[PDB]
């Protein structure tokens, strides 16, 4: 059972299911671009001072530890926000895609059908796999069944 974005069909043939490849893929690509971007953040690492010796320079080493501790915290917060912003963009792209799927289910199958306002429609004609597959393929013509 593939697909992520797709269509349904009720009717007398029972229920039937088919997937919109492009809508599925673009949702995917959005997530993969974010993953790549988050995987390629460049942050400098922290090492010891080369000049500061143990026993001799304990006071400096305490400050060094302090600089590191505050830096880790800052970078953590900075990275956390990046993830929160990524999730924001991914979730928002969902609504763009869904709305675009409704406008496609409104361009096809003509005015002979009536919209439930549910993402779902009530059609005059029967559907089933083949007819639903053409809706998924974007090749469905209403005029098959002599309709507007």
């Amino acid at each position, epitope marked *: 059972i593939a697909g992520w974005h797709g269509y349904t069909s009720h009717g007398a043939h029972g229920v039937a299911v088919a997937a919109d490849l492009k809508s599925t893929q673009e949702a995917i690509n959005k997530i*993969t671009k974010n993953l790549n971007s988050l995987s390629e953040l460049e942050v400098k690492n922290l090492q010891r001072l080369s000049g500061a010796m143990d026993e001799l320079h304990n006071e400096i080493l305490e400050l060094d530890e302090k600089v590191d501790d505050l830096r880790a915290d800052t970078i953590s917060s900075q990275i956390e926000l990046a993830v929160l912003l990524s999730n924001e963009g991914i979730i928002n792209s969902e609504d763009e895609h869904l709305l675009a799927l409704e406008r496609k289910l409104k361009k096809m199958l003509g005015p002979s059908a009536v919209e439930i306002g549910n993402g779902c429609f009530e059609t005059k004609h029967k559907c089933n796999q083949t007819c639903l597959d053409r809706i998924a393929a974007g090749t469905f013509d209403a005029g098959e069944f002599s309709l507007p």
Partner: antibody, heavy 120, light 110 residues
């Protein structure tokens, strides 16, 4: 993108092998990758495939139970592990990327090709 | 196997040659066909996808078609460099897996 399969392998019958693919110059994580083998003088044969962001792994019936296909999305790498090896498994292994997230599209890119020779 | 192609085809330089692929309802019938070209000792390349679509790198002398549970590749204006093995392929909804033809060797006389 360029996809580099792993080195050549020599295995004892019954052991297994692992074959890793690596794509260089971009990720392939948003696409399906299949594994395809070719016995000497013989044709292409699908083993199964994987689509790591989608979350799917699929297998050819003739290899079900004996092959394991996997991926590490963080290193942009895919793997194939084949168990219970037999002289019948001596052939060239091919990994390829598909045009989309699933196995329907025509695999447009492939590896240079892994060759694994079984014997004792 | 699953899809069946002739083991051999031949022609003379510049002629048109065709290679057929017979399947069933469970593969070619309900899914798209892809074609691949392979030279000896190298990996396969994609020649045709979605029944009738070429990659940008593929010459337009290559064309494909699909009818019923069958498919066909046609090569117009044969050249000497087209000598190679050819494989057809499709998803099969009964086996739930990808299938391939046995391969066809094309020989360029001359």
């Amino acid at each position: 993108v360029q996809l580099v399969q792993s080195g050549a392998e020599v295995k004892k019958p019954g052991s297994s092998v692992k074959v890793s693919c690596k794509s260089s110059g971009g990720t392939s994580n948003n696409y399906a990758i299949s594994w395809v083998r070719q016995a000497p003088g013989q044709g292409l044969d699908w083993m199964g495939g994987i689509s790591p962001i989608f979350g799917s792994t699929a297998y050819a019936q003739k290899f079900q139970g004996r092959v394991t296909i996997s991926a590490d999305i963080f290193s942009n790498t895919a793997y194939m592990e084949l168990n219970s090896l037999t002289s019948e498994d001596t052939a060239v292994y091919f990994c390829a990327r598909h045009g989309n997230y699933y196995y329907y599209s025509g695999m447009d890119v492939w590896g240079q090709g892994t060759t694994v020779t079984v014997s004792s | 196997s699953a899809l069946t192609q002739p083991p051999a085809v031949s022609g003379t330089p510049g002629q048109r040659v065709t290679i057929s692929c017979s399947g069933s309802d469970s593969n070619i019938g309900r899914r798209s066909v892809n074609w691949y070209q392979q030279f000896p000792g190298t990996a396969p390349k994609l020649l045709i996808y979605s029944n009738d679509q070429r990659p940008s790198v593929v010459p337009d002398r290559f064309s494909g078609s699909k009818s019923g549970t069958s498919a066909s590749l046609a090569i117009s204006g044969l050249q000497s460099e087209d000598e190679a093995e050819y494989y057809c392929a499709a998803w099969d909804d009964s086996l739930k897996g990808a299938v391939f033809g046995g391969g066809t060797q094309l020989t360029v006389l001359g």
